[model samples]
Target: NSYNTTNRHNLESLYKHDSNLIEADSIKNSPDIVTSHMLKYSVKDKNLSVFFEKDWISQEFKDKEVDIYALSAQEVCECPGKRYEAFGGITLTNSEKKEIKVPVNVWDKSKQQPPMFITVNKPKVTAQEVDIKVRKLLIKKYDIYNNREQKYSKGTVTLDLNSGKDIVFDLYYFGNGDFNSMLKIYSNNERIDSTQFHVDVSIS
Candidate 1:
């Protein structure tokens, strides 16, 4: 069947749920046509319209402190419920002699429980140095993946005092399946930043 025909059939089913919202004739004729009309009417109000792109990052960050020092970061947190997904970006202008510890929370039998942690070693030098590190840490102790999950990817953390006041690190999360989820940041053995983010497999 044609894509439009299938979409029209699906649209008709939706109208059954809300007769007041859509007309029978509209659904029977052309689904996309009716959808466009509805969207045009909906946009007339002060409502926001958002379109999700396949490669678009849902969340991003810059020059933010995860714990003690400032760093650049970006992430896409798309997951069902309160589960964590994957985030990749950068950390900038981080100069401190402290371990960074990022703690994360996960769902355990419908209860919020401690799942995993991220530990970043103190930068060797604060002046002009670049260090890239990447690893996969499980949110829950019992959660484990195949040997492929134990591998590491390359990412960079840099500092430029002359141009910027802070260092920047760029990283991203890419895994095989839903088994790998969530991320945290650490500085000086202290929990600094935590986000409940995950990318939907269907979306990403």
Candidate 2:
């Protein structure tokens, strides 16, 4: 519940809907509140210094959302320094302890001895998700918005999300006049591109 509120708050950040809520002086003096509130989750005031020092944690914001894109996903090496120490190479594993050697690249010219870089050996895809914007919706043979698309007998639907696999409903849908269904998407789900899908529907 807390995160749901937080997530909505993050979305709201794109707009400075209130003058009192955002101002030049506030950002200049209270940097903590700015960073902490903009993201859906909070990290300590100076928690990510290590990455910041390496130029990895650039959470800088701008006045125009158009000039930049929202970045929510990141892949980082938690131990870049430690990884560098094993400069000759490194090996990583799977949950089953299956191992593969991956080459490490030397950052400095002093250690240009190693000639290869690691290949992420077909890591198992643990999850996949999609973002869907409903153009129209219907359920239980009734046009939640009223349309002549059906009859007393239930039929079929193939609203195509080609190659878009999987659907796991967890909550209710809403809007378009009195309408809803269990349509919750979970936290760990990731967006898949072209990201369409397929479903069997016979509203009766």
Candidate 3:
């Protein structure tokens, strides 16, 4: 009868919020608006660039509120020019990709070059957690360097972690900067060190 008399005042406020009534009936029938994508990693040769504004948490902010942030070297050889190139972190499938434990004291020892696990495939945000902040270069430590020709490859970048502000990825190693050679540094999966220690990445 006209949809039960116009839902009877929305079923009396959905049974008086009876335990959030299945999360308000699945957010009143799901419209899903929780996305933020912007992966920028422009490595120009031992100089560096980094970015990951990937936030894809729908279901209405996975339950609300948030917000959100490069390279160089040289040489001539049919295939030689890669101090770094991790398009973006990697993860995907069965549990739907997840990882945000990349804060090993932000690696600091000297000239920098040891933190690589990049792989961007695009569109994949399970949103479980993320508040990365690797700092230590308060003001323009290094900038302006070019000499492109990337050959190293892997992809997958989607970050959100409810983006409540705190997604910082920095890398500013101007004195013989490095990164590329498969990049290493992990714990739990083992392989927790290989050399090239230094960390002064910045972006306030």
Ranked by TM-score from best down, the candidates are 2, 1, 3
lDDT for each residue of candidate 1 in 1-204, tens digit (9 for 90 to 100): 122333323322222222212111111111122221111112112121111122222121111232112121222256332221112222223445367543433333344554444445444221111111111222124222212343212222323243334344332222221211112231211111222221111000
Q: Which parts of model 1 are misplaced by more than 4 Å?
A: 1-88, 114-116, 121-135, 144-204
For all the candidates, what are their Cα RMSDs to the real structure? 21.4, 21.3, 24.3
> For model 2, how does the per-residue alpha-carbon lDDT over 1-204 read when each residue is reduced to its tens digit?
312433323322211122111111112112333332122211222121111111212243222111111112221366542110000010112233233333222212122333332222213211111111111222211332222331222223323335655544211222121101111112222322222333333333
Give model 1's TM-score versus the native structure. 0.22
**lDDT: worst 10-residue window of model 3:** 185-194
Clashes of 1: 36
Off by over 4 Å in 3: 1-88, 93-121, 125-143, 146-165, 174-176, 181-204
Worst 10 residues of 2 by lDDT: 82-91
- Over 22-50, each residue of candidate 3 has an lDDT whose tens digit, in order, gives 10111111133322422222222232211
Ranking, lDDT, top scorer first: 1, 2, 3
